[PDB]
Amino acid sequence: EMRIGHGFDVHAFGGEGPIIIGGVRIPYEKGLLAHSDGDVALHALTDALLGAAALGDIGKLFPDTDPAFKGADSRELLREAWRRIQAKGYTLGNVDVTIIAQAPKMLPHIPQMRVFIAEDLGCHMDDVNVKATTTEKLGFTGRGEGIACEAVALLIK
Amino acid sequence: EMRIGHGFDVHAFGGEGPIIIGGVRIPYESDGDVALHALTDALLGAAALGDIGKLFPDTDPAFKGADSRELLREAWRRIQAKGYTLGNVDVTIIAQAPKMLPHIPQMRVFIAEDLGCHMDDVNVKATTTEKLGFTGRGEGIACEAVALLIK
Amino acid sequence: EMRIGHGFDVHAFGGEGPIIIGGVRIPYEKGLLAHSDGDVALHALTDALLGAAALGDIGKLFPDTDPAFKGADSRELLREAWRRIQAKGYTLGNVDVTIIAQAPKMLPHIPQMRVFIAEDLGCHMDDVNVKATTTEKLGFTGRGEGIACEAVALLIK
Ligand SMILES: Nc1ccn([C@@H]2O[C@H](COP(=O)(O)O)[C@@H](O)[C@@H]2O)c(=O)n1
Ligand SMILES: Nc1ccn([C@@H]2O[C@H](COP(=O)(O)O)[C@@H](O)[C@@H]2O)c(=O)n1
Ligand SMILES: Nc1ccn([C@@H]2O[C@H](COP(=O)(O)O)[C@@H](O)[C@@H]2O)c(=O)n1
Ligand SMILES: CC(C)=CCC/C(C)=C/COP(=O)(O)OP(=O)(O)O
Ligand SMILES: [Zn+2]
Ligand SMILES: [Zn+2]
């Protein structure tokens, strides 16, 4: 059988650039405020993968009280999430990630996001979709206040 | 063969307390349950049976005073009647406050019982918008849900 | 052997109605500001179907640098996206679309939308779901600034 997972993440702008989206450093006037590297795309993708194994979420797997992964970048977190999913029997069906930002432009950076995700999951490029949209200057993303990301995943049990 | 559905719901605060989320009454310091409403829409969507509003209109007096678990169970009855069984569900609550985490285990249990499925087929999480937008400003709460049905 | 996709689209209100959603014209005091016809629903659906095929999004298929499909309505883009998807060996599992709008009223027009989608996708009506929700007067949709739409898709490989 197959299993569905969903992830959703939001960070507000603040501090100095650059931002890091899908493992890719992107120059911007502002950074993204977060407890770690603020990678909304990898954070949402990890939640979607973990969800499709009902492992709760990032917060459950890497809690307050566990020093092991404190200060770890999102790719480190993604890989360890994967390792722990792959060992529960699951293999990868496919993923689709949707970044929601008015700015910066994401389009030129998406190719390398896809490469980094494929590497971290040990899968073909063909199993990884990443796209970006604006909200036409509407809402807290449209006004340039933060970045949101939605992600969905299908795993084979 | 499997089938995908999606749900999204929003509840505005009007006296802001208490609220009911995932069948759990939470002190904030229809019945407005965004989690179950979005989960129901997702299951009904996977079954191409429309949404909550299509099955139980506000105009129809027959479900006046029905809570979200009752609509969830009735929705699931009609889905099973069409030959579907559960794969799994993933629910994501979007709220600046109140704190959902202590109540999530209970929500999960309520959903598993209502759908007659294993706990491991039910995933519920909560997250914030970091003080951004209507949820971030404390105006209301939202929920995104997805579901996979079988055959 | 199934594959998942997700799509998300937002257009703002501007100038004059009617609006067009799911291929159906709906009377409203405002129209939708868009490069194309502004069909949020068909645009989200297309992105979801393409995402499942790892073919990115409509922008990747139909840039504004490209003359071929310039000025095409959304139904034509969907049928073309669908042609390219089917060329990779994919067939339709099922689709589910969620329109997020305070107004106008969508429900009376939804059966026709489903008819139009099933025809464009060459599938049974049983494989197409379309729902609509308000945001209880909250956010940019609730205040009537615009309309959003989300969609999910399963393809079979
Ligand atoms: N933050 C963003 C948003 C959109 N884009 C690009 O803009 C194109 C059209 O976006 P939109 O539908 O919001 O007008 C997308 O295909 C592509 O992702 C981008 O590069 N960075
Ligand atoms: N734009 C909209 C929004 C909702 N509706 C209708 O209202 C019902 C309930 O929506 P809500 O719970 O957000 O008030 C929907 O099931 C149905 O689609 C509509 O017809 N047009
Ligand atoms: N309204 C909320 C939001 C988050 N939480 C909890 O906070 C943790 C992290 O949330 P966030 O990503 O917004 O910082 C979640 O794992 C958990 O659900 C909560 O209890 N109530
Ligand atoms: C799944 C979700 C949340 C999708 C929509 C993302 C988005 C652009 C939210 C905007 O917030 P807002 O409309 O509340 O901004 P504000 O009320 O400040 O206009
Ligand atoms: Zn994050
Ligand atoms: Zn569009």
XYZ file of C-alpha atoms and ligand atoms in Angstrom:
549
model
C 0.000 0.000 0.000
C 0.841 3.695 -0.199
C 0.507 6.427 2.413
C -0.082 10.196 2.127
C 1.732 12.885 4.118
C 1.293 16.663 4.351
C 3.602 19.437 5.537
C 3.113 23.187 6.001
C 5.575 25.760 7.314
C 5.814 29.538 7.706
C 8.626 31.873 8.708
C 8.611 35.698 9.038
C 11.308 37.924 7.512
C 13.844 39.632 9.796
C 17.562 40.007 10.423
C 20.052 39.978 7.570
C 20.035 37.852 4.438
C 20.512 35.525 2.885
C 17.615 33.091 3.260
C 17.978 29.321 2.707
C 15.196 27.556 0.732
C 15.364 23.862 -0.219
C 19.009 23.810 0.845
C 19.790 26.708 -1.531
C 21.163 30.023 -0.178
C 19.289 32.881 -1.839
C 20.428 36.508 -1.457
C 17.791 38.775 0.057
C 17.527 42.105 1.898
C 16.121 40.295 4.953
C 16.700 36.861 6.476
C 14.088 34.520 7.936
C 13.561 34.404 11.688
C 13.452 30.867 13.071
C 14.776 28.556 15.787
C 16.918 26.942 13.120
C 17.954 27.754 9.600
C 14.391 28.623 8.671
C 14.223 26.369 5.622
C 10.448 26.333 5.085
C 10.603 24.047 2.067
C 12.700 21.306 3.721
C 10.815 21.760 6.986
C 7.460 21.234 5.197
C 8.905 18.342 3.137
C 10.215 16.587 6.269
C 6.799 16.953 7.945
C 5.118 15.452 4.880
C 7.514 12.475 4.803
C 7.150 11.903 8.563
C 3.379 12.246 8.367
C 3.174 9.525 5.722
C 4.637 7.244 8.415
C 2.504 8.900 11.144
C 5.720 9.694 13.060
C 4.066 12.940 14.171
C 6.332 15.744 12.993
C 9.802 17.360 13.207
C 9.037 18.592 16.752
C 8.202 15.088 17.908
C 11.253 13.451 16.332
C 13.636 16.246 17.361
C 12.192 17.670 20.644
C 13.191 20.460 23.074
C 15.066 18.109 25.331
C 17.169 16.190 22.778
C 20.633 17.785 22.304
C 21.621 15.450 19.419
C 20.233 17.521 16.545
C 20.226 21.021 18.116
C 21.686 23.577 15.710
C 21.496 21.131 12.794
C 20.671 22.449 9.340
C 17.523 21.280 7.602
C 19.229 18.814 5.246
C 20.813 17.043 8.201
C 17.317 16.879 9.687
C 15.782 15.695 6.404
C 18.369 12.903 6.046
C 17.900 11.684 9.630
C 14.119 11.794 9.207
C 14.557 9.734 6.033
C 16.985 7.218 7.606
C 14.360 6.647 10.356
C 11.529 6.306 7.820
C 13.515 3.967 5.520
C 14.159 1.707 8.515
C 10.439 1.493 9.352
C 9.933 -0.387 6.059
C 8.972 2.558 3.856
C 10.356 3.457 0.474
C 9.672 6.610 -1.546
C 6.827 7.089 -3.964
C 7.125 10.771 -4.808
C 7.104 14.338 -3.379
C 5.745 17.727 -4.471
C 6.735 20.965 -2.713
C 5.034 24.349 -3.200
C 6.866 27.497 -2.002
C 4.719 30.595 -1.431
C 6.670 33.838 -1.531
C 6.212 37.226 -3.177
C 9.984 37.603 -3.243
C 12.757 36.734 -3.747
C 12.405 35.053 -7.159
C 12.691 31.292 -6.633
C 12.554 29.970 -10.189
C 16.313 30.014 -10.967
C 17.113 28.298 -7.658
C 14.591 25.406 -7.904
C 16.787 23.148 -10.128
C 19.403 22.907 -7.329
C 16.734 22.458 -4.631
C 15.573 19.428 -6.596
C 19.146 18.058 -6.847
C 19.714 18.418 -3.085
C 16.394 16.768 -2.200
C 17.042 13.858 -4.605
C 20.462 13.304 -2.945
C 19.085 13.422 0.613
C 16.377 10.876 -0.218
C 18.505 8.671 -2.523
C 15.912 8.923 -5.274
C 15.728 9.896 -8.909
C 15.126 13.496 -9.919
C 11.847 12.215 -11.383
C 10.394 11.646 -7.893
C 10.899 15.247 -6.775
C 8.777 18.225 -7.741
C 9.387 21.784 -6.533
C 7.486 24.838 -7.722
C 6.909 28.421 -6.502
C 3.947 30.820 -6.556
C 3.092 34.335 -5.326
C -0.192 35.456 -3.843
C -0.360 38.527 -6.156
C 0.571 41.034 -3.404
C -2.233 39.631 -1.185
C -1.889 38.422 2.396
C 1.119 38.306 4.692
C 3.137 36.657 1.926
C 1.900 39.058 -0.742
C 2.942 42.013 1.399
C 6.416 40.539 1.797
C 6.164 39.778 5.504
C 7.182 36.116 5.315
C 7.396 32.906 3.288
C 5.130 29.875 3.455
C 5.562 26.385 2.029
C 3.224 23.460 1.467
C 4.397 19.932 0.766
C 2.789 16.528 0.062
C 4.397 13.054 -0.124
C 3.493 9.491 -1.049
C 5.351 6.583 0.539
C 5.188 2.870 -0.217
C 4.691 0.711 2.893
C -6.548 1.588 -6.267
C -6.321 4.646 -4.016
C -8.021 8.044 -3.881
C -6.861 11.495 -2.659
C -8.869 14.225 -0.982
C -8.189 17.649 0.453
C -9.848 19.817 3.064
C -9.434 23.383 4.327
C -11.534 25.098 7.030
C -11.500 28.380 8.946
C -13.088 29.370 12.252
C -13.347 33.025 13.294
C -13.340 33.913 16.985
C -16.517 35.713 18.025
C -16.244 35.448 21.751
C -12.966 33.553 21.578
C -13.454 30.780 24.116
C -13.787 28.032 24.509
C -13.132 26.386 21.156
C -13.575 22.783 20.041
C -10.787 21.248 17.940
C -10.551 17.573 16.925
C -13.564 16.916 19.167
C -11.658 18.402 22.138
C -12.866 21.460 24.088
C -9.926 23.809 24.588
C -10.056 26.867 26.895
C -8.948 29.966 25.007
C -7.546 32.628 27.335
C -21.569 24.876 13.331
C -19.508 24.104 16.432
C -16.439 25.616 14.833
C -14.214 22.542 14.813
C -11.746 23.292 11.993
C -9.797 20.003 12.352
C -12.761 17.674 11.930
C -14.453 19.925 9.381
C -11.369 19.930 7.171
C -10.853 16.146 7.689
C -14.484 15.454 6.735
C -14.193 17.586 3.548
C -10.978 15.694 2.647
C -12.603 12.266 3.085
C -15.712 13.394 1.197
C -13.453 14.845 -1.498
C -11.509 11.591 -1.900
C -14.917 9.941 -2.450
C -16.040 12.701 -4.844
C -19.034 13.180 -2.563
C -18.593 16.985 -2.473
C -18.178 18.492 1.002
C -19.884 18.945 4.404
C -21.977 21.781 3.030
C -23.260 19.623 0.228
C -24.404 16.735 2.401
C -25.553 18.743 5.406
C -26.646 22.232 4.235
C -27.261 24.974 6.822
C -30.697 25.297 5.195
C -31.579 21.661 6.016
C -33.105 21.484 9.548
C -32.242 17.747 9.935
C -28.687 18.362 11.233
C -29.485 21.466 13.281
C -27.338 21.173 16.411
C -25.176 18.328 15.040
C -21.584 18.415 16.278
C -18.524 17.782 14.135
C -17.980 14.166 15.268
C -21.557 13.358 14.349
C -21.091 14.801 10.847
C -17.728 13.022 10.608
C -19.323 9.606 11.437
C -22.282 10.209 9.096
C -19.915 11.289 6.298
C -17.821 8.134 6.835
C -20.948 5.934 6.734
C -21.801 7.246 3.261
C -18.205 6.832 2.075
C -18.023 3.210 3.232
C -21.414 2.675 1.575
C -19.735 3.653 -1.715
C -17.133 0.889 -1.218
C -14.233 2.844 0.281
C -12.102 1.860 3.231
C -9.468 4.038 4.917
C -5.829 4.380 3.917
C -4.607 7.220 6.136
C -5.272 10.896 7.067
C -3.012 13.852 7.882
C -4.409 16.916 9.627
C -2.551 20.208 10.208
C -4.028 22.829 12.574
C -2.936 26.437 12.005
C -3.308 28.523 15.143
C -1.298 31.136 17.046
C -3.127 30.038 20.199
C -4.345 28.258 22.270
C -1.725 25.516 22.619
C -2.917 22.373 20.850
C -0.115 19.918 21.643
C -1.418 18.660 25.019
C -4.737 17.806 23.341
C -3.553 16.179 20.123
C -3.276 12.603 21.517
C -6.971 12.878 22.461
C -7.951 14.243 19.011
C -6.138 11.332 17.372
C -8.096 8.844 19.516
C -11.432 10.534 18.712
C -10.666 10.364 14.972
C -9.473 6.707 14.996
C -12.634 5.621 16.860
C -14.949 7.666 14.555
C -13.277 6.170 11.435
C -12.873 2.667 12.942
C -9.167 2.625 12.093
C -5.738 2.138 13.678
C -4.045 4.956 15.566
C -1.142 4.642 13.102
C -3.516 5.700 10.286
C -4.192 9.101 11.959
C -1.689 11.951 11.953
C -2.516 15.287 13.588
C -0.128 18.236 14.034
C -0.389 21.906 15.041
C 1.658 24.837 13.783
C 1.655 28.670 13.818
C 2.080 31.399 11.220
C 4.656 33.153 13.455
C 2.286 36.098 14.180
C 1.551 36.647 10.485
C -1.868 37.084 8.817
C -5.303 36.582 10.421
C -4.254 33.461 12.348
C -1.045 35.141 13.469
C -3.046 38.232 14.638
C -5.310 35.977 16.718
C -8.453 36.589 14.609
C -9.227 32.927 14.039
C -7.766 29.486 13.341
C -7.461 27.301 10.286
C -6.796 23.675 9.315
C -5.505 21.874 6.254
C -6.234 18.178 5.844
C -5.462 15.407 3.331
C -6.760 11.808 3.084
C -6.144 8.598 1.177
C -9.014 6.115 0.643
C -8.862 2.594 -0.758
C -10.942 1.173 -3.664
C 1.783 2.534 -8.905
C 0.468 6.005 -8.026
C 1.876 9.546 -7.887
C 0.743 12.619 -5.869
C 0.447 16.304 -6.865
C -0.520 19.595 -5.204
C -1.395 22.986 -6.717
C -2.102 26.452 -5.304
C -3.212 29.672 -7.000
C -4.387 33.180 -6.032
C -5.803 36.015 -8.101
C -6.817 39.465 -6.868
C -10.085 41.188 -7.755
C -9.875 44.061 -10.219
C -11.884 45.833 -12.880
C -15.163 44.228 -13.795
C -16.855 40.831 -13.724
C -17.861 38.289 -14.481
C -15.217 35.937 -13.104
C -14.446 32.521 -14.574
C -13.896 29.537 -12.228
C -13.642 25.874 -13.266
C -14.462 27.011 -16.808
C -17.760 28.572 -15.672
C -18.622 32.284 -15.889
C -20.014 33.615 -12.612
C -21.585 37.074 -12.163
C -19.799 39.282 -9.624
C -19.396 43.031 -8.978
C -15.657 42.593 -9.644
C -13.529 40.615 -12.107
C -10.154 38.917 -11.607
C -6.770 40.523 -12.393
C -4.642 38.001 -14.278
C -2.172 37.555 -17.128
C -4.528 34.832 -18.415
C -8.313 34.468 -17.830
C -7.697 34.205 -14.051
C -9.262 30.776 -13.510
C -7.766 30.021 -10.067
C -9.379 26.563 -9.971
C -8.202 25.285 -13.335
C -4.773 26.788 -12.675
C -4.419 24.992 -9.305
C -5.695 21.737 -10.841
C -3.174 21.952 -13.707
C -0.303 22.624 -11.259
C -1.405 19.600 -9.197
C -1.532 17.311 -12.257
C 1.857 18.557 -13.495
C 3.372 18.257 -9.995
C 2.356 14.594 -9.900
C 4.158 14.165 -13.237
C 7.228 16.069 -11.938
C 6.705 18.520 -14.815
C 6.875 21.579 -12.527
C 3.968 23.983 -13.060
C 2.065 25.896 -15.803
C 4.799 28.557 -15.890
C 7.383 25.927 -16.844
C 5.137 24.708 -19.684
C 3.730 28.085 -20.694
C 6.129 30.991 -19.926
C 5.123 34.544 -20.865
C 8.216 34.465 -23.077
C 6.356 31.906 -25.205
C 4.057 32.853 -28.113
C 2.477 29.428 -28.768
C -0.034 29.443 -25.894
C -0.249 33.204 -25.304
C -3.860 34.305 -24.766
C -5.152 30.727 -24.444
C -8.006 30.239 -21.972
C -7.438 27.992 -18.952
C -9.297 24.990 -20.388
C -6.944 24.883 -23.373
C -3.871 25.022 -21.098
C -5.288 22.189 -18.967
C -5.935 19.985 -22.035
C -2.428 20.751 -23.290
C -0.826 20.122 -19.875
C -2.822 16.882 -19.833
C -1.582 15.877 -23.296
C 2.057 16.311 -22.185
C 1.371 14.405 -18.933
C -0.208 11.474 -20.797
C 2.792 11.419 -23.140
C 4.963 10.447 -20.154
C 2.758 7.366 -19.649
C 0.455 8.704 -16.904
C -3.290 8.138 -16.527
C -5.773 9.715 -14.129
C -6.439 8.416 -10.646
C -8.616 11.201 -9.268
C -8.696 14.951 -8.511
C -10.002 17.154 -5.685
C -10.167 20.957 -5.902
C -10.902 23.454 -3.096
C -11.966 27.013 -4.005
C -11.349 29.541 -1.261
C -13.642 32.598 -1.667
C -16.041 34.698 0.405
C -18.107 35.552 -2.672
C -19.474 34.930 -5.227
C -21.497 31.790 -4.480
C -19.806 28.802 -6.135
C -22.004 25.810 -5.205
C -24.724 26.411 -7.874
C -21.968 26.400 -10.507
C -19.936 23.396 -9.231
C -21.745 20.567 -11.122
C -20.935 22.316 -14.416
C -17.283 22.785 -13.371
C -17.021 19.030 -12.722
C -18.586 18.277 -16.105
C -16.067 20.585 -17.841
C -13.072 19.085 -15.958
C -14.045 15.463 -16.645
C -14.436 16.274 -20.357
C -11.039 18.019 -20.426
C -9.405 15.128 -18.577
C -11.333 12.430 -20.503
C -12.429 10.796 -17.239
C -15.495 9.777 -15.241
C -17.390 12.327 -13.137
C -16.636 10.006 -10.187
C -12.948 11.052 -10.497
C -13.556 14.812 -10.089
C -14.437 16.616 -6.866
C -14.817 20.383 -6.528
C -15.708 22.077 -3.249
C -15.766 25.713 -2.085
C -15.267 27.277 1.343
C -15.258 30.757 2.908
C -12.666 31.986 5.434
C -15.426 33.390 7.681
C -14.650 36.982 6.621
C -11.006 36.616 7.653
C -7.871 37.206 5.538
C -7.666 38.716 2.046
C -10.311 36.274 0.778
C -12.685 37.032 3.635
C -12.327 40.781 3.063
C -13.053 40.229 -0.613
C -9.669 41.309 -1.982
C -9.224 38.070 -3.920
C -9.907 34.347 -4.348
C -7.540 31.450 -3.711
C -7.715 27.817 -4.716
C -5.967 24.613 -3.713
C -6.007 21.268 -5.528
C -4.639 17.723 -5.177
C -4.223 14.959 -7.759
C -3.347 11.278 -8.064
C -1.981 9.980 -11.326
C -1.353 6.316 -12.177
C 1.978 5.234 -13.685
N 8.409 33.581 -5.207
C 8.238 33.286 -6.488
C 6.962 33.196 -7.035
C 6.794 32.886 -8.382
N 7.915 32.657 -9.205
C 7.727 32.324 -10.650
O 6.592 33.072 -11.161
C 5.836 32.206 -12.031
C 4.375 32.654 -11.940
O 4.023 32.896 -10.566
P 2.593 33.492 -10.145
O 1.480 32.419 -10.647
O 2.495 33.772 -8.691
O 2.338 34.842 -11.037
C 6.002 30.809 -11.436
O 5.886 29.831 -12.475
C 7.436 30.831 -10.923
O 7.531 30.065 -9.718
C 9.210 32.749 -8.642
O 10.226 32.560 -9.309
N 9.357 33.062 -7.290
N -17.588 30.923 -2.310
C -18.419 30.055 -1.760
C -18.146 29.574 -0.492
C -19.000 28.650 0.101
N -20.142 28.199 -0.579
C -21.074 27.212 0.048
O -21.085 27.374 1.487
C -20.901 26.076 2.087
C -20.201 26.236 3.446
O -19.023 27.069 3.364
P -18.488 27.792 4.701
O -18.531 26.684 5.890
O -17.127 28.391 4.564
O -19.606 28.899 5.080
C -20.046 25.324 1.085
O -20.220 23.932 1.279
C -20.676 25.756 -0.224
O -19.732 25.724 -1.286
C -20.408 28.680 -1.870
O -21.403 28.279 -2.472
N -19.544 29.611 -2.463
N -1.235 26.358 18.217
C -0.187 25.568 18.440
C 0.884 25.565 17.555
C 1.980 24.737 17.791
N 2.020 23.890 18.914
C 3.218 23.018 19.149
O 4.401 23.792 18.774
C 5.290 22.956 17.990
C 6.027 23.760 16.902
O 5.203 24.779 16.316
P 5.879 25.864 15.321
O 6.442 25.220 14.094
O 4.758 26.991 14.954
O 7.001 26.667 16.181
C 4.404 21.912 17.324
O 5.157 20.704 17.141
C 3.292 21.699 18.354
O 2.057 21.451 17.686
C 0.930 23.901 19.811
O 0.912 23.190 20.814
N -0.163 24.738 19.565
C -2.942 27.300 3.651
C -2.885 28.823 3.647
C -2.801 29.583 4.988
C -2.908 29.484 2.421
C -2.872 30.868 2.175
C -1.475 31.478 2.403
C -1.565 33.005 2.523
C -1.125 33.875 1.333
C -2.044 33.588 3.701
C -2.176 34.974 3.878
O -2.564 35.380 5.121
P -3.777 36.428 5.366
O -4.857 36.415 4.165
O -4.373 36.116 6.697
O -3.112 37.817 5.427
P -3.895 39.088 6.037
O -5.252 38.788 6.793
O -2.891 39.760 6.907
O -4.343 39.756 4.653
Zn 10.752 25.935 9.507
Zn -3.423 31.761 -12.442
